[PDB]
TrEMBL record:
Keywords: ATP-binding, Calcium, Kinase, Metal-binding, Nucleotide-binding, Repeat, Serine/threonine-protein kinase, Transferase. Residues 311-346, 347-382, 383-412, 417-452 form the EF-hand domain. This is non-specific serine/threonine protein kinase. Ca(2+) 4 binds at D430, N432, D434, E436, E441. Residues 7-264 form the Protein kinase domain. Its cofactor is Mg(2+). Belongs to the protein kinase superfamily. Ser/Thr protein kinase family. CDPK subfamily. CDD domains: EFh (cd00051), STKc_CAMK (cd05117). InterPro entries: CDPK_Ser/Thr_kinases, EF-hand-dom_pair, EF_Hand_1_Ca_BS, EF_hand_dom, Kinase-like_dom_sf, Prot_kinase_dom, Protein_kinase_ATP_BS, Ser/Thr_kinase_AS. It comes from Toxoplasma gondii. Disulfide bonds join C203-C450. Ca(2+) 2 binds at D360, D362, N364, Y366, E368, E371.
Length: 452
């Protein structure tokens, strides 16, 4: 059983935990699916293979409406291919930030689904460990949509990368016992409690300028309902949170018992009989929170893609150089395709043609391969550049066009860019920056922060 015999790649869905997720189509039935591809080289394995294979076969037999459905598993010399159901509703928080109203009832409905999925996985002795908002996908982009939890089972068998672009935003949700090494299924209740806290206040209970500051707060395990917006929240909501954020895991409430809590029972009634004050301050805070996380994430991805495109620019140039036996710097369509594939080994027809459209619209003859390389690599970094700009614009909620030094400090702290380093970089871009930057200056900073 070879993966490529059955599935063809259609389009990339993203780079989630442990590797790329590619939208694929069954070659016979047309069935679309989301395949997580884990590189055995890039990602280390924790357990023996037998244990991994058994857990995988178990997961194929489990079905729950709030857990991502796993269909199939493949393996070759380099990779694992995990074939899951594709969900098109995006990440929960990216929906939440577009809503005009949000109440305790909305929060309770969300958390009841998460707790239902978790309870079922815990019954089968499967622990997530890395539960966070990113792992809550929607079937459709609407507040009416079901939540599907992704990544159950992976933490037990795969080591997470320490690359900051991957470990960004993780510190808020991780249980203290996970930091110290002894953990069980209760760690998922803790992570869910942090998410619930954020839904109801828009602020993480354990917050900080950078990873270590956040982790230090999580380890001490102390948090409060001191913020003004907690006055708008029921005592019942707060009581559940206290049980879910109980430090010693044996004293911490179970996912199953959390489903039986008064708050869940009361606020998830299909008929909203209780007061429904919109948590307006929480929505504004959550928008700020999401915006900050997505911008820091986009910033790191942009720098990563800039480095990647630097390499591939040199490699592709060398590839074409070898093919340039004439030494005239010009190649035809055929040769450009071969070289583009030669780099890929280190759809293709159509991508080349998009480049040739800009270079030689008429296509009357040969193409300066140097001209080609630029446009080829330039447009390949488009997604990251456009996503960076979109994230900047979304973070800039008042449409000021600027981000302040306080905001830069938050964004770079989350990104693990050193305070003195980015300040120095700012000074070089704009000596009279006046404690704020526009998008262009922000982008210039990112470029200097990755050796450009
Ligand atoms: C034993 C677990 O095996 C799997 C198999 C498939 C998976 C697909 C996704 C997924 N990511 N994304 C984007 C956010 C990058 C998705 N988008 C839509 N649907 C999806 N299903 C995913 C995540 C985890 C998965 C784990």
């Amino acid at each position: 059983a070879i993966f490529s015999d059955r599935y063809k790649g259609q389009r990339v869905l993203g780079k989630g935990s442990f590797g790329e997720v590619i939208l694929c189509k069954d070659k016979i039935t047309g069935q679309e699916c989301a395949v997580k591809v884990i590189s055995k080289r890039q990602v280390k394995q924790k357990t023996d293979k037998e244990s991994l294979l058994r857990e995988v076969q178990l997961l194929k037999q489990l079905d729950h409406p709030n857990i991502m459905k796993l269909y199939e598993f493949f393996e070759d010399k380099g990779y694992f291919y995990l074939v899951g159901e594709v969900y098109t509703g995006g990440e929960l928080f990216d929906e939440i930030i577009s809503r005009k109203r949000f109440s305790e009832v909305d929060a309770a409905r969300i958390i009841r689904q998460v707790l239902s999925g978790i309870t079922y996985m815990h019954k089968n002795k499967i622990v997530h460990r890395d539960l966070k908002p990113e792992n809550l996908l929607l079937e459709s982009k609407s507040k009416d949509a079901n939540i599907r939890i992704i990544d159950f089972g992976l933490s037990t068998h795969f080591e997470a990368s320490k690359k900051m672009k991957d470990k960004i935003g993780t510190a808020y949700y991780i249980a203290p016992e996970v930091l110290h090494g002894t953990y069980d299924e209760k760690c998922d209740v803790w992570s869910t409690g942090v998410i619930l806290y954020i839904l109801l206040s828009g602020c993480p209970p354990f917050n900080g300028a950078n990873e270590y500051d956040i982790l230090k707060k999580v380890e001490k395990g102390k948090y409060t309902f001191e913020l003004p917006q907690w006055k708008k929240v029921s005592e019942s909501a707060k009581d559940l949170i206290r049980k879910m954020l109980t430090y010693v895991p044996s004293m911490r409430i179970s996912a199953r018992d959390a489903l039986d809590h008064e708050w869940i029972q009361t606020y998830t009634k299909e008929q909203i009989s209780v007061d429904v004050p919109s948590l307006d301050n929480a929505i504004l805070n959550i928008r700020q929170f999401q915006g900050t996380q997505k911008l820091a994430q986009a910033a790191l991805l942009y720098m990563g893609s800039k480095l990647t495109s630097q390499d591939e620019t040199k490699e592709l140039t060398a590839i074409f150089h070898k093919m340039d036996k004439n030494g005239d710097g010009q190649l035809d369509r055929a040769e450009l395709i071969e070289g583009y594939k030669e780099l890929m080994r280190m759809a293709v027809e159509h991508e080349v043609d998009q480049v040739l459209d800009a270079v030689d619209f008429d296509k009357n003859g040969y193409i300066e391969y140097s001209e080609f390389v630029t446009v080829a690599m330039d447009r390949k970094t488009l997604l990251s550049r456009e996503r960076l700009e979109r994230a900047f614009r979304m973070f800039d909620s008042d449409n000021s066009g600027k981000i302040s030094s306080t905001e830069l400090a938050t964004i770079f702290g989350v990104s693990d860019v050193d305070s003195e380093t980015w300040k120095s970089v700012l000074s070089e871009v704009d000596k009279n920056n006046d404690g704020e930057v526009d998008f262009d200056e922000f982008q210039q900073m990112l470029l200097k922060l990755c050796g450009n």
